[PDB]
Amino acid sequence: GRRIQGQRRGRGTSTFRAPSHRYKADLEHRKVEDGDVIAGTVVDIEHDPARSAPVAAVEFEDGDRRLILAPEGVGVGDELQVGVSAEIAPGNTLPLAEIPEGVPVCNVESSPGDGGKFARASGVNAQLLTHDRNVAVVKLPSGEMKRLDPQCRATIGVVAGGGRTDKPFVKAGNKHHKMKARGTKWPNVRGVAMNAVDHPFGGGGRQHPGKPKSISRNAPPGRKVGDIASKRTGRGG
Amino acid sequence: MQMPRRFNTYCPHCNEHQEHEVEKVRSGRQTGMKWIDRQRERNSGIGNDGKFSKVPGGDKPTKKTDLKYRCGECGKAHLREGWRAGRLEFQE
Amino acid sequence: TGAGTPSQGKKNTTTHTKCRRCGEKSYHTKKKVCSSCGFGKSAKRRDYEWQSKAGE
């Protein structure tokens, strides 16, 4: 047959790529030598096209103008501090070691100094729980207990733009506009609505899948469709 | 059918009649050193292996008689043409 | 709209032009490559053995 849509995806053509040129900034944490003596005033609150959430434009003491992943509550004129001896206030970035337990953090790092990997989407937060000299256990928004290095930096507060999911798109036109700012192909044609040549679920006189939807992890790309390595299906039971 | 374990018959070796013993031919083990075994390892490569890619066939409803006629005195055996028999049992 | 006659009317784009290297109207001005001599692609002249019969 022909390659399925998921195989055309990996080729990285125009249709599948994200509009990178229209993106503002690669929201990463600042680099401090040590000591903490790095701070700055917030100039403006802008819209990040990449995440549909706001981003704070901060100007630092050493002339540096950079955009940062803004938590809730941050405004113009606010002073945010980045470093080891930073204040335990919303918007400040300091390692997990210095941050007290039970305090909601966002833009958490995997490896120290990487820039921030976890808890970056609209209104989410990571929850810091346990402390040690070796391990700082953070509870990620998915409900997972991530055992992390205490030297991993994190910003205090929940990410801004909370409750974005609440309002329905209502009409296809609204989904269109959102999708045009991401790296996705939209609309979605069901495989069951395609021809045999085009998808494993294509064909027949009526629309139904050919074999059971649950596919093995070991399945090759071109066959791995439907419910990938599902531990279960359905709502009941 | 039933068949006697021992009976008198011609020994092509001794050129005279003697009391022969009958035994079902037990299959001998393969060495894996024959020419066919070497051709299997040689001729087999990427893809289909031709003749070596085949599997052993089926069965005939009834197999023939596969016996060994052991002589009582000289101790040498001979082979005879077999006949179709569903089950062959020995008497004593 | 028919793929024939009415689709021919749109055809006012210039692609293949006179080549600086060989003189054939095969230099694709959008691709900057010659479809005849391979100017733009290779330093060596474009030639293939299928341009003539196998025993010739």
């Binding site: - | 490569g45 990427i46 893809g47 289909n48 | -």
Partner: protein, 194 residues
């Protein structure tokens, strides 16, 4: 008595033993961070180099080349193929890694001609070979009796034509008798059956 060279040779008989084991573990670390083709001022195996034809003279260049270990980096068929020709994983190239090394070196030095090469070890994923190249235009070679043969017009691009020792050995030209029916005088003259 034994030459000092015979000691470098005896050391390389077992590159995983003694002081050389410690030396390779150290060198390969710097080699892995070096390029594909790196010119070295002095040969790692002086005995082998000199035995192969090297001289500490003007226009006698040496260079280390790293080539990947393993079989052919082959693509699968995009068109119809019978079972025999459907392979990818088990297919290997007909030119040994040493010959791939000599060519990469000769291309890096378009003016020089390949004299010979030798192995200088391998790690888990690559092999290293040092190629001795000669300048056929330097009067230091044009006048050298033991090297001036490489200056002749018919010695141009000798590595791409398989005229190297590693080339001739890979072409099946070692044995003068039985077994070399399809190899000598050339593979192309024998219908490509070697």
């Amino acid at each position: 008595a034994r030459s000092a060279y015979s000691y470098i040779r005896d050391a390389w008989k077992n590159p995983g033993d003694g002081q050389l084991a410690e030396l390779q573990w150290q060198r390969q670390q710097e080699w892995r961070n070096e390029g594909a083709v790196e010119r070295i001022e002095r040969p790692t195996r002086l005995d082998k180099a000199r035995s192969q034809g090297y001289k500490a003279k003007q226009g006698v260049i040496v260079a280390r080349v790293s080539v990947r270990k393993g079989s052919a980096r082959k693509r699968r068929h995009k068109a119809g193929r019978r079972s025999k020709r459907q392979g990818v994983t088990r297919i290997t190239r007909r030119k040994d890694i040493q010959r791939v090394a000599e060519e990469r070196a000769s291309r890096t030095f378009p003016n020089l001609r390949v004299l010979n090469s030798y192995s200088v070890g391998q790690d888990g994923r690559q092999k290293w070979h040092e190629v001795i190249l000669i300048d056929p235009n330097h009067p230091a070679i044009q006048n050298d009796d033991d090297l001036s043969w490489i200056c002749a017009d018919d010695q141009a691009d000798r590595v791409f034509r398989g005229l190297t020792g590693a080339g001739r050995r890979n072409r099946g030209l070692s044995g003068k008798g039985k077994g070399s029916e399809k190899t000598r005088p050339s593979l192309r003259s024998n219908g490509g059956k070697g």
